[PDB]
Each structure stands twice: as structure tokens, then as C-alpha cells.
Amino acid sequence: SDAVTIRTRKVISNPLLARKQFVVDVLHPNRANVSKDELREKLAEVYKAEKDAVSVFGFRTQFGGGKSVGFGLVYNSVAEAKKFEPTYRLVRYGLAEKVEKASRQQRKQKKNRDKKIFGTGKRLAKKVARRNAD
Amino acid sequence: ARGPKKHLKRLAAPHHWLLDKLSGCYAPRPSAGPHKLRESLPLIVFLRNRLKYALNGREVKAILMQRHVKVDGKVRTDTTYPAGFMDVITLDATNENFRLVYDVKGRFAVHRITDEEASYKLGKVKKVQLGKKGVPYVVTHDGRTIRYPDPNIKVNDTVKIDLASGKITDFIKFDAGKLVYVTGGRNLGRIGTIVHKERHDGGFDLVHIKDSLDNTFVTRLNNVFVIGEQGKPYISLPKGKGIKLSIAEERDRRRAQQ
Amino acid sequence: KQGFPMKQGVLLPTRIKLLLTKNVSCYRPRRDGERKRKSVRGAIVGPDLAVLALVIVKKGEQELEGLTDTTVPKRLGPKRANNIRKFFGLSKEDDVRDFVIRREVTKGEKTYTKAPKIQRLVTPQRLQRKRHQRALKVRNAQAQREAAAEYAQLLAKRLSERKAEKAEIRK
Amino acid sequence: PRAPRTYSKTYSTPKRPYESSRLDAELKLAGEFGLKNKKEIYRISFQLSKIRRAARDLLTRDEKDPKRLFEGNALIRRLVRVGVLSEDKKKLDYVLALKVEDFLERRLQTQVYKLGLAKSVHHARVLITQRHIAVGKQIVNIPSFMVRLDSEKHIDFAPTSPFGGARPGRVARRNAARKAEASG
RNA sequence: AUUCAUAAUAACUUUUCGAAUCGCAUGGCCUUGUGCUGGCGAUGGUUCAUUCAAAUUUCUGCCCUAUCAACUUUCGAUGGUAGGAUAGUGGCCUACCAUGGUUUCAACGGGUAACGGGGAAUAAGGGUUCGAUUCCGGAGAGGGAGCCUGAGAAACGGCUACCA
RNA sequence: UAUCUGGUUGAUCCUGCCAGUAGUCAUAUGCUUGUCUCAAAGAUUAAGCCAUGCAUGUCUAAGUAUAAGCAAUUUAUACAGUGAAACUGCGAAUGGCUCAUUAAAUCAGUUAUCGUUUAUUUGAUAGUUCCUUUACUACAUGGUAUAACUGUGGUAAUUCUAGA
């Protein structure tokens, strides 16, 4: 917004992962809260790269508020950002979504059952149904 | 043991890797490779806590599988590839090569240099013998063997490997008055212009090595590695030149030129 | 009864506990080298038997509606290129590799052959691999030979220099 | 398994609990330096004993030894940084003879009271535990800070504190509301 | 320091072997074949060019007990020769000699409410207790044994048989 | 932080213990359920027993395909997308747990392998075989079933299997 003096330091530009990673320093005295979307779009508008090219996390707020420090990385393009950013991070940002599945215990039990079952199981089910019928 | 060891924990890993005791309980174990387990630096930890290029194991492994880095002229997409002393790893992105050298205090220092030093490197001969079909050969510290060496090469010598061909461009022998590099013990990373040797027939030879400060010390023959003749080096010396200054002088020099 | 299979080769009419291994009938090894104790029925037909699996070798004169009037068709034809070529039995150069019998299946209204991958076929790619291996072997052989020759002449000139030096010395 | 995380003690209960002299003297010092508890003098005596033992085992070694020189210089540098000793005395007699009273009359709790911006050591303690005081840029809430003259150079009040402005406060706001209701 | 790594010499091999695997680029010439040629990537060697690993092994060091002074064998109980077995050393196991080995400098036997270390608690010093447990090494995965696969297991979230 | 004090006598000086005192990455227990911090945690007795559910499986551009799966095919009259199951390869001998056994046995420091190790190692392959052979004989390069599948059956029955 106005006089937010949000800065980035220790910036390194690595074409290996094709990004620019740095520590973000946010000074918001007498300000209620800065959100993840606000911070990312502000870093985007000051780095003139792209709105979704920037990704910020961490955001440890110093004791008593007023100042916060985090990590921030800007990709050269949305394609590289999607390729390199973690799936959970993309889901948290909204750039991606992972389809809900069964819980760990349930899927492990499914794997136990179909590891006990040998073969496809269609023939076994047909034989069981035939035996039940007769 | 019932089998080989496949894990390594923090605080049980060699000191020169500089692993923090928190933020995990296991250490990156280097598998079979060109260097020892202790006297080597895995690529993952090298990328993680020496250059800060990447900050995640997942990102590091992705970097390795995307073929964006290579070792000694080879990609070597191993997530825990061990690269020890005198190892050259060039980076096509900006074309910067890192030599894994030993600092004065005894840790895996990294030296960033250009394409010529990327191409040419140094190696220490471990033994020279005759193979099958009457073929003589040598053994180096990194396993970079050259076939059919010149007959002057004996044990405890150093050679220059061009990393592209199989020919030894330069060879430097073992005698008095040569620039050396002690890799082992408490003097890890010291250059001291070897003076003389006590053989002690039966093994475990001792070498008298004296730094330019006239700081003379001794080391096992198994730890010294000649890196060039007096004066000019074969490879660029790291920062500090391997001096190991006295504690009071080093502390007040830090206080002055902090 | 109770589902104990007959194992051929025991020559007894009773049930025994056999240590069955891999490649032994009435047992499949879930682990490598896992031997298992299994109760198996003997190889003599007796009252203990519940079902008897039999094969017809020669047929009679009476006909049933479920043995010759109907027959299940084969599901998959030969898969190897050599297998199909010797099943067709046309010639060595009768283009069987492309004349192989084609089976059609369709999901809805669109029909496709979806012909499978035939193996052990003579291919330009396989020929190229043969040429590349030949070339690799030959260039490696010549490189080793020339390296040996260069080392031999190096040793020869070093020996001549050493002989000249030691002849000049000790005058 | 999880790598171990080390912890240490910081105070030492004295060998005999009931001395009409030691207990009385420690009560005087706690009262006159604003110390809510006795474990605080216990821990300050623990640090004093640690530094005195370091000085003693440093002095037991012969002169000009480089280890002695380095350890003494580091100890002197730390003690000058904290500031309990005058910065123009290198005889080490004062650092070895440093007493609990001399050590305590230098920490920031006495400094604020002697400078007069709190008018009471207990009032200063309540201000610190209520967080309406910042020694420097970061707002502090712990009585035992031991400023190293950094906060002295950066003396000020906390931004979100009384006399710092930008906030009347809850009690002030309700007082103003009640006054407005009473007036009309 | 070796009978060392080696090279050769009639023979032994009953035969283990040197892409009868697959992706990716496919641009050059015509003697027309889709011929000649063009580059990389997981599979291999009966070979070494050290490495992650196992195996025994040298020298010293362990608590309390004499209410434990002698201990060690139908044919292992110390050594010599030879063989077998082992990935090889070796009484590791077999055939053939002497009475050989250990011991008051404590053998042997018993106990351990004994897994051994780094180490934990007071520190003037010298010390006295503890270490099951965050790392290393060893043993086990009900007690015993015996085994297949495997480079590596006496493997037990592998198997076989007997036993709370 | 190189410290003592109370207790035998009417009283005194003593060797002497019983106490008092202070700690425990030493426990248990009783009274207090106010707050940043990492978090010790069924070891002592019972290495005693386990009902239950989990803790070892595995893919790439680059081993074999057709659950009778998905749609573009438009480079395939043999495909180079996806490819669940099954075969092959590898792992499962790692890790985690406990301390029962164990007194020169482990273990610690230091050695020896000129007494042996070596999946994937790994640095690379190795112009040596047309064995009644200057012509039984394909090298523009051979043969069969064991699996999933099409159906049949066995018991309450098991990560059971006979089957064509």
C-alpha cells in the first residue's frame, strides 16, 4: 500500500531451479495484518515479473508484531513455478488442487486386502458367487 | 552387522560436512563412489549448506534428475553422489566450476573458478603396478585411472588430468622442496613446502612440512599430497593460503579487519 | 475331499506332508526360495477322491452337445515373429512379419485392430544396433592397439636414452 | 531417533540453608536491588562463581602462555562489553574480585531506577512484565536483560506504550466514553 | 620382505563367456537396398584401477569372590606332518607323536540385583558411585537348532522340526 | 564453591558412630490443574503373554502386455500416450526395538590381511569360437510350456490350488 517499506534481502538468482530466492522483511507498524495474497501481489508489483510468479512462505512475526521475516522466491514464468513449487504449497496458494482420497489407514488396508488377493480377483469373485449360489 | 550400512545419522557424520544437530536426525549417506566415506562431501549437502542454491531435498533431487549439473564432465544423477578432495563440478548455468578443496581450518571449502581450471585438475597416485596383458597402470585418490603411464611415475606422486582425454599432461614427483597439501589429521588444508622425510622402514613414514611462517610440523606420508613445485601452484590456492596462524594473531587480525 | 490336490509321482493312495518348493506342483512360492510344508493327496485313485480331472485321448461314436457340437475359440494367436512365421509355414521371405493374422475388436461403433507388438523380428533398428556394436568393438580395438604401440616406442626411446647415458658414464 | 538437545542449570542452592548472616545479607541485597526471589541471587552467584573459577584456573597457569592470553582477553572483552568494569583497568584484580553487589549494581534494573524513568524498581519490573517499555527496537518483557550499552545508546520508549502515542488504550477509551456520557 | 602383480611354454575346462536386451536423435551418398554410414541413455565381463560392507586377527586394559589351588582328554587338550572344509589363516575337522598348554603376577570355578564404550553426578587435589536409555560396536527378535534364495541372513514382519 | 553442627558425663578432653546439611541428563509418592521453550516416557519386577488394525515395496524417454481400461490415432499395414493386474530385475540382510546371554567374551585404543572381502560397484568392455571343421549349418540373426486371461471344481475353511 503506502509506506509499507517491504523489502527483500540476501537475494540469489539461481537458473538451476530458474528462480530468485531471498528473505522477505515486512515492516507494518500500526497495521492490523498483512496476508499471504497481499504480500505476494505486492512483491509481484515491485518485481514487475508476474502476480503468480512470486511465492512467499515462513512469515515469522517478531514478538510484539510490527515486523516479520520470511522466505520468498520469484520464478521466471508460471510454468516453471508450477513445475518446481511443491504440490502442497500450490494447493495452499490455490494454484492447484489435489483430489481428496481415502485416509492412510484405509488405503493401507486396501493394499493389504489386494496383496492377500492373488490375480485380478474377478475370477475369484465369480467362483465365490457361484459357490454361494450352489 | 548382517549387511552393509545404508543409513547415516547426524552427529555421527564427519565434522567437515557441517550438519546442524537439529532439523532432522539422519545425515545424507554417500553410497559407493570415487572417494572415502569420511573424506568426501556429498552433492546434496554441498548444494544445501554451502551454496544455499537449493533449500529442500526434493528440490535438490529434482535439480539432479533434470541434468542441470554435472561432475567431472559427467552428469552423475545420484542424489547422494560423493565428491571429495580435488573434485571438479562445473555448472553450465553461468558456466561456473567449483573445486572441492580443503580450507585452513579443516572443512570442505569451495573454490569458484573458470573453464580452464574446470578442464584441468590434479590427482594423487596411490599405487602403480602391472595389469593383465603386461599393461601398467596407476591408482588415484578419486579412482581416475590413466592407462599406460610413463615409467617415471612411482608411488606418492601427483598428476594432472584433463578430464576429457586419458593422457597425463603434467606429472610431479616426490622429493624435497615441493608445494604440498596435507589432507588428513588435524592439519587439514595446510601448504608447507615439504623439507625432508623419516622413512621408518616398516611403514608409517613421517614428513617434515614447514609453512611460509616457518611453522614446521610433521604428518604421516599417507596424508600429504604434493600439489606443485615451489612458487607457482598447479591449482589456485584457497583463501588463507593454508597458513594456520597462531590464535592470538588470528584473533586480533579478525578484530582489526573484521 | 477338503480340497487337497493330487500330486503325480508319489505312488501312494493316502495323504502326505510334502516339502514343496519352487517349480513343484500344488505350491506357489510367495518368497524367493521359500519351501513350504503342504498336505497333498497321493497319486492313486480311490474312494477318498471327490473330483477326477480327465483328458479325452480318443473319442467314441456317441456325441454330446457340449464336447464337439460347440468349442471355445482361441483368444491370442502366436506372439513372436518366429512363432507366427512357423505357424503360417509359408516361406522365409513370404513377408509373414506383416502378413501375420489380424484380430479385430471394437468397443462401440468404431473398430480397430490394435495389433500387438511382435517380437524377435528383423528390424532396421536392430540392424543399426548391430552395426553400432561392430563399430564400437573395432574402434576400441584399434585405439588399444595404437596406445600399446605408442607406449612401446616410448619405452624403446627411453631405453635407448638410458643406455646412452650409462654408456657415457663410467668411463 | 531424535538427536539430543542439551540443557543446563543456572543456579546453586548454598550448602547451608540457615545462616543469620548470609540470609540477612542476601535479603538486604535483594531488597535494595529489587529482586523478587532468592533463586535470582542464587543464579547470579552461580555466574559469579563460574567467572571467578575461570579467572582462577587462568591465573594458575604461567605467564605469557598463549592460551592464557587468549582466554583472559576474551573474558576481559566480554566483561567490558557488559560494562560492569571500568574500561581502563587491565590488572584483572577487579574482575577476579568482582562481588555480587558490584555485579548487580550495573544491570539494567538498577540503571533504569538510577536514571529515574521508573521511580521504583518494582514499578520498573511491572512495566517490563506488562511490556510497556522497550530498551531498543524490539519490545522486551523480561526483567533480567543486562544491557551492553546498546540499549543505553538506543534509549527510548516502546511504540505501543504510554507516552508513545497512536493508542489511547482500553481504560482511557472507556474513561472517555464515561465522561462523554456524564457530560451528555 | 613373498612363490608378489605379471608374460610365455605341450595339456586339463566336464565348457562360465565377449548386446539372439530396449528407448532417443535419424539430416549424408548412390553401385535401390530402406544397402552403406551419423550421436546419446538403465542391462554386462570368467578382469583389476583404490571405494559403502564383511571376516577373522596383534598388542594392553574389565566388577566381587580362595566360604573356588590346581585347571586342561572315550578321540582335541598345547604342538609337528598330511588331508578335508572354508571366500581363504587356524585342531576349524580328521589321520598319525610327546604329556604338552594355563596358574599365587590369581589359572580354573562361582556370583553379577554385568551388554562394553563416548560418557552422567561433585570438582582444591587424589577420588566414590552410575551408564538399560537419544551415537558407535555386539546379541536377540517366544527357547533351541537346521536351512533355500541371495553379493551379503543362521533372517524369524523367510522356511523346516521339537519344546514353557 | 580445601567449612561444619546436635547426641554418651554432674562437668571435661577424646577414638567413635547415629543423625542434621547440600546435589543427582535417580526414581517413586503426596499436596498446585496460571503462562513463551524443545520435549524424558512401561528399563528395573515379567527377553511374560498378546485380541486388534499398521510397520516393505518398487518405475523411467530407456525389460515383457490386450482387466474385453481411457482417446487422440493422422509418423506406423509392427508400436514408440496412458498402461491397472501378472512375469522379469532389485530391495526386503536397511531401519526401529530391547539388554536375555555374555567376564579377555564383547568393547575401547592400536594393528594384520604378503591369510581373505566386493549386489548396482565402479574408471572401460575383450577384432582370438563360421569345433567331420576350404562348407552337418539362419546371424536382413532358432525351439517348447510354466503366468494373468477363456472357461471348469474341492472343502467352514488359509497371501490354498488341480486343472485343458
Side-chain angles (χ1 to χ4, degrees), chain B residues 9 29 33-36 129-130 132-133 137 139-140 143 145:
Chain B
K9 312 141 188 191
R29 171 139 185 100
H35 296 249
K36 272 318 208 311
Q129 66 153 330
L130 264 286
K132 306 277 176 50
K133 293 214 274 197
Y137 71 95
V139 195
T140 59
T145 299

Side-chain angles (χ1 to χ4, degrees), chain A residues 104-105 108-121:
Chain A
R104 256 281 298 261
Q105 48 210 12
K108 289 215 270 199
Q109 269 151 104
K110 260 72 191 272
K111 118 192 191 173
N112 259 2
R113 312 172 255 267
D114 73 344
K115 104 162 298 194
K116 263 166 101 163
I117 286 289
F118 173 69
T120 64

Side-chain angles (χ1 to χ4, degrees), chain C residues 3 26 30 38 86 102 112 114 117 120 126 145:
Chain C
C26 321
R30 262 61 152 192
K38 296 284 201 98
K86 318 221 157 61
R102 320 278 297 213
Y112 224 145
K114 60 97 145 191
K117 295 310 135 272
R120 291 183 96 153
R126 272 171 75 178
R145 249 196 306 276

Side-chain angles (χ1 to χ4, degrees), chain D residues 61-153:
Chain D
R61 145 177 329 132
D62 54 337
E63 198 68 40
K64 91 222 289 186
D65 260 38
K67 175 61 138 44
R68 209 272 327 269
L69 302 170
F70 199 96
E71 295 322 292
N73 265 352
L75 178 73
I76 266 47
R77 186 257 216 199
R78 213 142 40 77
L79 267 291
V80 152
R81 177 112 158 211
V82 58
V84 304
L85 191 35
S86 96
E87 306 90 2
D88 211 74
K89 200 280 318 188
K90 287 327 142 162
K91 330 282 173 311
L92 164 140
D93 45 358
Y94 277 98
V95 65
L96 59 90
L98 211 45
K99 281 156 281 249
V100 47
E101 308 260 5
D102 218 322
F103 194 100
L104 277 175
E105 72 109 7
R106 179 82 205 137
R107 102 149 179 280
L108 93 166
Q109 277 330 104
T110 323
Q111 226 59 37
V112 47
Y113 184 53
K114 71 180 54 102
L115 193 77
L117 69 149
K119 96 188 133 174
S120 147
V121 312
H122 305 69
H123 191 207
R125 186 135 47 253
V126 202
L127 212 78
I128 299 157
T129 193
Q130 89 195 35
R131 137 153 47 71
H132 277 327
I133 166 66
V135 278
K137 177 60 221 84
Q138 221 279 326
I139 322 97
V140 152
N141 60 292
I142 51 92
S144 46
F145 194 85
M146 302 46 173
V147 308
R148 48 166 103 79
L149 305 110
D150 183 23
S151 294
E152 255 185 320
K153 295 167 225 182

Side-chain angles (χ1 to χ4, degrees), chain B residues 79-92:
Chain B
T79 62
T80 167
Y81 172 77
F85 187 64
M86 277 308 185
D87 261 315
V88 152
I89 56 199
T90 323
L91 194 84
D92 56 354

Side-chain angles (χ1 to χ4, degrees), chain A residues 30-49:
Chain A
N30 272 336
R31 307 312 164 205
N33 288 142
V34 72
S35 71
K36 278 304 173 186
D37 54 348
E38 199 37 69
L39 209 44
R40 214 137 38 71
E41 80 169 359
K42 281 214 60 39
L43 262 80
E45 78 103 9
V46 198
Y47 274 110
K48 75 228 159 182

